[PDB]
Amino acid sequence: TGGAPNRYRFKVKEDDPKGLFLLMGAKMHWLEEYVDKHPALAGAYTGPNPQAKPDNYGDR
Amino acid sequence: DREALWSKWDNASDSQRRLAEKWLPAVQAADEMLNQGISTKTAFATVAGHYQVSASTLRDKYYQVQKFAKPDWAAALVSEFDEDAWQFLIADYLRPEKPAFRKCYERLELAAREHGWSIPSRATAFRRIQQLDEAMVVACREGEHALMEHLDAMQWINGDGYLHNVFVRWFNGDVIRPKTWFWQDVKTRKILGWRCDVSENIDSIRLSFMDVVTRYGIPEDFHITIDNTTGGAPNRYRFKVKEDDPKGLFLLMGAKMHWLEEYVDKHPALAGAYTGPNPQAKPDNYGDRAVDAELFLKTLAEGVAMFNARTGRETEMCGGKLSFDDVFEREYARTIVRKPTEEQKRMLLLPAEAVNVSRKGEFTLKVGGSLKGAKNVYYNLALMLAGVKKVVVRFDPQQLHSTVYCYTLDGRFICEAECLREYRRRQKQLKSATKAAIKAQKQ
């Protein structure tokens, strides 16, 4: 359900989204290569590396 | 030069070499007929007759091989595109990202479109990627750089450590993962000693060594290896132990210094504690499952005993038949060792961090932790009678109530002195004041 405090300094929000979806006339039922692996982010993406040095990343 | 010719013979296919082999006896036989001065017609007709071959071909090839020496007659018988795009692609693959080749290629196609570059085939591109180097892949990940006389029993021992994946409830009540240090005989592979503790520090190494030299003795030529290709910290005795130089003690023992998971971690009795290499493991079950220190250590001792006693060891010494115990018992009897004196063993007893000495020649150690609480005060006349401010105290936990030995900060023995939950409350209060504040900051 998400919610929690307060990005607007006031808390948002415990609700029922479900009702809104049903109201829209919707019947409810219950890229990693393009984003995470793009060259421009190479300093930030670490990759599935089991051993990765934490000392480099605050800058990256 | 016959180098290029012979390399052409060499590089030839088996089928091609076979072809040359088939064509050689016909050319050689033909040579014999001409030597005899036989008409060219009769000679070729005869060869083409016996051997199924075109006479014209044989004639032509004979003249072709005529200029070549006879041993080498066999050997006789046998991407223009935009550099910017290529550079762009190579630049992309070598990133630690290391994107998929087909997709990185598609991106390259977009760039090529924007710049109007003429790109080669994906197969050609990858082919060339294979042709680049083994070293380049490592250039991308820095990987390969991360890899890159008669021995008596007891003559050379190796020390190694092991972090357990089993949760054990220690003597102080805390649930931790124990770390054990082992000493192994290099020749026979027998484990000679061990000590287990809550964390990695010099004490387990030192004491396991003590166990090894007390049980099997000190050989006349002693080599010790710890591949590194100081521990200490507070206060299990309520007084801190210890910043030192172990190194000197080892050299003094007459030792030249050099720089079971199935049996322990995987034993059935610990099944609630060992989690196994499970990437997803529920933390909610384990506080109840952690095994007792006594059970873990008994399982450890039995695991060591079984590891050593296990036959069918495939080593030179065991010859696929004996166990580490057998070969160790055999070779140890053929080595010359000496037993350590009581004094040597006592010099190995534990060092306390430097304590202050008053003008009266007395100093204090606040005993606690695993030992009964008491504030011990030690004294001697030699402490007030010469130059000293601080002193390092050497002791046996069992003998703290009576005799300790004082050393100078530089290691010179001075004399011995006769004797004339606490901080955990702070640790816990600090823990609560952390957790509450952390949750409050998260929300």
Quote the DSSP letter at residue B177: -
> How far is residue B432 CA from its own chain's centroid?
40
* Beta carbons of B404 and B416 less than 8 angstroms apart: yes
Nearest CA in chain B to A32: B99
Residue whose entry in the numeric block shows the structure tokens 């026979």: B188
What kind and span of H or E run contains B416?
A: strand B413-419
Q: What CATH number is attached to the domain comprising B61?
A: 1.10.10.60
B99·A38 Cβ contact <8 A? yes
Q: Which residues contact B223 (CB under 8 A, 6 or more apart)?
A: B155, B156, B157, B255, B256, B258
- Separation between Cα atoms, residue B321 and residue B341, nearest integer Å: 37
- Separation between Cα atoms, residue B425 and residue B172, nearest integer Å: 14
**Are both B296 and B223 inside the same structural domain?**
yes
* Beta carbons of B381 and B427 less than 8 angstroms apart: no
Which residues in chain A are closer than 8 Å to B92, comparing Cβ atoms?
39
Residue whose entry in the numeric block shows the structure tokens 């009897």: B333
- Separation between Cα atoms, residue B84 and residue B223, nearest integer Å: 59
Residue whose entry in the numeric block shows the structure tokens 């027998």: B190
Q: Return the biggest CA–CA distance within chain B.
A: 128
Nearest to B401 by CA among B354, B365, B369: B365
The reply to whether A11 touches chain B by the CB within 8 Å rule is no
A47·B97 Cβ contact <8 A? yes
**Out of A4, A5, A37, whose CB is closest to B97?**
A37
* Beta carbons of B59 and B44 less than 8 angstroms apart: yes
Structure tokens at B351: 């060092």
**Are both B349 and B416 inside the same structural domain?**
yes
**Are both B366 and B312 inside the same structural domain?**
no
Which residues in chain B are closer than 8 Å to A34, comparing Cβ atoms?
103
* Beta carbons of B429 and B387 less than 8 angstroms apart: no
B98·A47 Cβ contact <8 A? yes
Q: What is the 3-state secondary structure (H, E, C) of B260-313?
A: CCCCCCCCHHHCCCCCCCCCCCCHHHHHHHCEEHHHHHHHHHHHHHHHHHCCCC
**Are both B359 and B386 inside the same structural domain?**
yes
**Out of B92, B96, B99, whose CB is closest to A33?**
B99
What length is written for chain B? Answer: 443
> How far is residue B205 CA from its own chain's centroid?
18
End of a domain among B148, B167, B182? B148
**Are both B210 and B278 inside the same structural domain?**
yes
Q: What is the 3-state secondary structure (H, E, C) of chain A?
A: CCCCCCCCCCCCCCCCHHHHHHHHCCCCCCCCCCCCCCHHHCCCCCCCCCCCCHHHCCCC
Classify the C-alpha dihedral B388-B389-B395-B399 as positive or negative. Answer: positive
Question: Kind of pairing, strands B168-169 and B291-292?
Answer: parallel
What length is written for chain A? Answer: 60
Nearest to B129 by CA among B93, B104, B81: B93
Resolution in angstroms for this experimental structure?
Answer: 3.7
Which residues in chain A are closer than 8 Å to B443, comparing Cβ atoms?
4-5
How many other CB atoms sit within 10 Å of the CB of residue B270? 22
**Are both B46 and B140 inside the same structural domain?**
no
Burial B334-347 (b: 16+ CB within 10 A, else e): ebebeebeeebeee
User: Please, what is the Cα angle at B420 between B241 and B343, to 5 degrees?
Assistant: 55
Nearest CA in chain B to A5: B443
- Separation between Cα atoms, residue B409 and residue B385, nearest integer Å: 17
Nearest CA in chain A to B99: A37
**What is each CA distance from A47 to A32, B41, B97, in whole angstroms?**
11, 77, 7
End of a domain among B107, B128, B148? B148
Please return the burial class of B351, using the count of CB atoms within 10 Å of its CB with bins 0-12, 13-18 and 19+.
buried
Interface of A with B in 25-44 (CB under 8 A): 33-34, 37-39, 41-42
Quote the DSSP letter at residue B411: S
**Are both B330 and B368 inside the same structural domain?**
no
Interface of B with A in 81-140 (CB under 8 A): 92, 95-100, 103
**Are both B156 and B217 inside the same structural domain?**
yes
**Are both B8 and B86 inside the same structural domain?**
no
Which residues in chain B are closer than 8 Å to A5, comparing Cβ atoms?
443
Which residues in chain A are closer than 8 Å to B111, comparing Cβ atoms?
none
A41·B97 Cβ contact <8 A? yes
Q: What is the count of residue pairs from A and B with beta carbons less than 8 Å apart?
A: 24
A34·B103 Cβ contact <8 A? yes
Q: How would DSSP label each residue in B206-270?
A: HHHHHHHHHHH-EESSEEEE--------S-TTSS------HHHHHHHHTEEEE--TTTTTT-GGG
* Beta carbons of B141 and B96 less than 8 angstroms apart: yes
**Out of B95, B103, B443, whose CB is closest to A42?**
B95
**B250: containing domain:** 231-254+341-420
**Are both B211 and B285 inside the same structural domain?**
yes
**Out of A4, A38, A39, whose CB is closest to B443?**
A4
Structure tokens at B397: 């936990």
- Separation between Cα atoms, residue B31 and residue B38, nearest integer Å: 10
| Method by which this entry was solved | X-ray
Structure tokens at B403: 């005799």
The minimum CA-CA distance between A52 and chain B, rounded to whole Å, is: 12
Nearest CA in chain A to B441: A5
Structure tokens at B366: 């606040």
**Are both B281 and B235 inside the same structural domain?**
no
The annotated binding site of B is made up of 160, 227
> How many structural domains is chain B composed of?
5
**Are both B84 and B60 inside the same structural domain?**
no
- Separation between Cα atoms, residue A35 and residue A32, nearest integer Å: 5
